[PDB]
Design an enzyme around this catalytic site. Structure first.
Site, mmCIF file in Angstrom:
data_model
loop_
_atom_site.group_PDB
_atom_site.id
_atom_site.type_symbol
_atom_site.label_atom_id
_atom_site.label_comp_id
_atom_site.label_asym_id
_atom_site.label_seq_id
_atom_site.Cartn_x
_atom_site.Cartn_y
_atom_site.Cartn_z
ATOM 1 N N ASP A 227 1.543 -0.191 -3.145
ATOM 2 C CA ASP A 227 1.577 -0.093 -1.676
ATOM 3 C C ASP A 227 2.543 -1.105 -1.065
ATOM 4 N N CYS B 47 -7.596 0.923 -7.125
ATOM 5 C CA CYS B 47 -6.762 2.116 -7.218
ATOM 6 C C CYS B 47 -5.284 1.727 -7.128
ATOM 7 C CB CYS B 47 -7.151 3.111 -6.139
ATOM 8 S SG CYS B 47 -6.199 4.602 -6.246
ATOM 9 N N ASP B 48 -4.763 1.212 -8.241
ATOM 10 C CA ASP B 48 -3.372 0.803 -8.352
ATOM 11 C C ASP B 48 -2.826 1.399 -9.636
ATOM 12 O OD1 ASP B 48 -4.820 -2.192 -7.367
ATOM 13 O OD2 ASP B 48 -3.471 -1.089 -6.026
ATOM 14 N N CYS C 44 -5.219 7.864 -3.568
ATOM 15 C CA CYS C 44 -6.500 7.548 -4.187
ATOM 16 C C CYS C 44 -7.600 8.509 -3.752
ATOM 17 C CB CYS C 44 -6.899 6.113 -3.862
ATOM 18 S SG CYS C 44 -5.636 4.944 -4.327
ATOM 19 N N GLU D 176 9.235 5.374 -11.884
ATOM 20 C CA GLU D 176 9.015 6.680 -11.279
ATOM 21 C C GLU D 176 10.105 6.954 -10.256
ATOM 22 O OE1 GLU D 176 4.822 5.982 -10.777
ATOM 23 O OE2 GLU D 176 4.415 8.149 -10.878
ATOM 24 N N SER E 212 8.207 11.604 -9.905
ATOM 25 C CA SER E 212 6.986 11.876 -9.160
ATOM 26 C C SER E 212 7.248 13.013 -8.177
ATOM 27 C CB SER E 212 6.486 10.630 -8.433
ATOM 28 O OG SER E 212 7.558 10.046 -7.732
#
Length: 486
Positions: A48, A89-90, A120, A372, A398
């Site tokens: 993030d 959530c990483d 997430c 990514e 991605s």
């Protein structure tokens, strides 16, 4: 008097990780009442804060290795008897699991939890890995799909701390849980939920860290035996909270057990086996919901994480074949030595319908970091070419395109994989039906090009990217950094 670490994930203050700290106190609470002395400590994270499209993204996989290093350094340094990692959530929380495999001291993983209705809520990397961790018996049942702000997640954290203290007194070790059977169980679940292609990389890395054999071939083998059972974002329709309400990973796992896929005799962190832990779960998903389909009416009949091989990827490659209407293309090659050069050419109108776009020197060493890349697929969609060009890379993409998108091409270009020998205008075939990724030149022109190829100079001679590039292995080994060093 057991000394138990609490590896608190997401220790890089930003408005996104308020909740993870609430669980650490719960883990420390549960550890003290169970008779342990907790030692809380923090690990880095960059999710993030990373800017998609620039070189910050090259540090993403790097931070997975740094997180593993930190936990192994602390736990060995402090002579701890066990460790409880809380992974938020990483995308780099699989680093905690790599450390647990390296340490092989009693361990349990607590997922920070999902958010309720973006990255997430669906089955992106973090949610796929947390579900995989539950499938392998390294997290308690139901714990991988609980919402972060919910009370059962705090209760599950305390319970995880208690179970870990029992696991120290019984010496249930990661090496006894993270077996080949547990990895086979995790691949099946990852196929059954429509999980992220990044989970392939992280699961390979955990297996090659703990010493159990696992290869891309095993993903492809299990892919044909396991249907997509769940209708989940990004590819599908529901989010993780709907999956949790429909019975979660235990319901998914039980369907796979009764239908011959899951190894029921694999061990979990509580000391019960998979079959024992799932004993009271119904054989079929509840009625009145279509989040989890039945075995006989699946979302797709086989899994979505396909492995393509050929002279262009002798070690293999990963392609999500989920929303791809025509899963074959043969076209002229358009080659780029970086994400930037590729994005530039797309925006300059240099890619046409029918092209096969090759982005190389973005692999684990070539990047370095196997970043990514979202810009190329997004730019391709904006040019209206999504369904008419193929995309391949030794890095990662991605986002989909409704066309063929192939990542993890191994061997990567940096070490002289055939992807480094593609020349502009070569014909390339991407054929999902043949599981084929091919450069359409004679075997002997490929060998004559190979004889003239020279290793490139590293993009970063110093710093952490240099240290990473020096140690990192192939992506078909999960891009581990601690094997075959001597």
């Amino acid at each position: 008097k057991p000394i138990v670490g609490i590896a608190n994930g997401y220790s890089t203050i930003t408005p996104c990780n308020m909740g993870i700290n609430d669980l650490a106190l719960r883990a420390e609470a549960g550890l003290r009442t169970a008779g342990a002395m907790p030692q809380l400590f923090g690990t880095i994270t960059i999710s993030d804060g990373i800017s998609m499209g620039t070189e910050g993204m090259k540090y993403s996989l790097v931070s997975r290795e740094v997180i593993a290093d930190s936990i192994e350094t602390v736990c060995n340094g402090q002579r701890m008897d066990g460790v409880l990692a809380i992974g938020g959530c990483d995308k780099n929380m699989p680093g905690a699991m790599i450390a647990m495999a390296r340490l092989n001291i009693p361990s349990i993983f607590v997922y920070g939890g999902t958010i309720k209705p973006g990255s997430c809520g669906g089955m992106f990397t973090a949610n796929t890995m947390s579900s995989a961790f539950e499938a392998m018996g390294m997290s308690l049942p139901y714990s991988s799909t609980m919402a972060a702000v919910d009370g059962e997640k705090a209760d599950s954290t305390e319970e995880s701390a208690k179970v870990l203290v029992e696991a120290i007194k019984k010496q249930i070790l990661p090496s006894q849980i993270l077996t080949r059977k547990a990895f086979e169980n995790a691949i099946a679940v990852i196929m059954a939920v429509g999980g992220s292609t990044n989970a392939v990389l992280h699961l390979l890395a955990i297996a090659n860290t703990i010493g159990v054999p696992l290869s891309l071939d095993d993903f492809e083998t299990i892919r044909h035996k396991v249907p997509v059972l769940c209708d989940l974002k990004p590819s599908g329709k529901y989010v993780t909270t709907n999956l949790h309400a429909a019975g979660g990973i235990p319901q998914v796992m039980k369907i796979l057990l009764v239908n011959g896929i899951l190894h029921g005799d694999a061990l979990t962190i509580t000391g019960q086996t998979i079959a024992e832990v799932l004993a009271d779960i119904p054989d079929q998903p509840p009625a009145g919901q279509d989040v989890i389909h039945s075995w006989d009416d699946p979302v797709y009949q086989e899994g979505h994480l396909a492995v393509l091989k050929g002279n262009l990827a002798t070690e293999g490659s990963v392609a999500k074949i989920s929303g791809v209407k025509k899963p074959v293309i043969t076209g002229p090659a358009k080659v780029f030595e970086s994400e930037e050069d590729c994005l530039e050419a797309i925006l300059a109108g240099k890619i046409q319908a029918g092209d096969v776009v090759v982005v190389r020197y973005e692999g684990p060493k070539g990047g370095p970091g196997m970043r990514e890349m979202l810009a190329p697929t997004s730019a391709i969609i904006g040019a209206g070419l999504g369904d008419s060009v193929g995309l391949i890379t030794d890095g990662r993409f991605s986002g989909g395109t409704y066309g063929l998108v192939v990542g993890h091409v191994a061997p990567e270009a940096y070490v002289g994989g055939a992807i480094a020998l593609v020349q502009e205008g070569d014909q390339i075939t991407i054929d999902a039906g043949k599981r084929l990724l091919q450069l359409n030149i004679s075997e002997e022109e490929l060998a004559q090009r190979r004889a003239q190829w020279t290793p490139p100079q590293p993009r970063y001679p110093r710093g952490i990217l240099a240290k990473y590039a020096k140690l990192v292995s192939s992506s078909s080994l999960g891009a581990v950094t601690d094997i075959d060093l001597f």
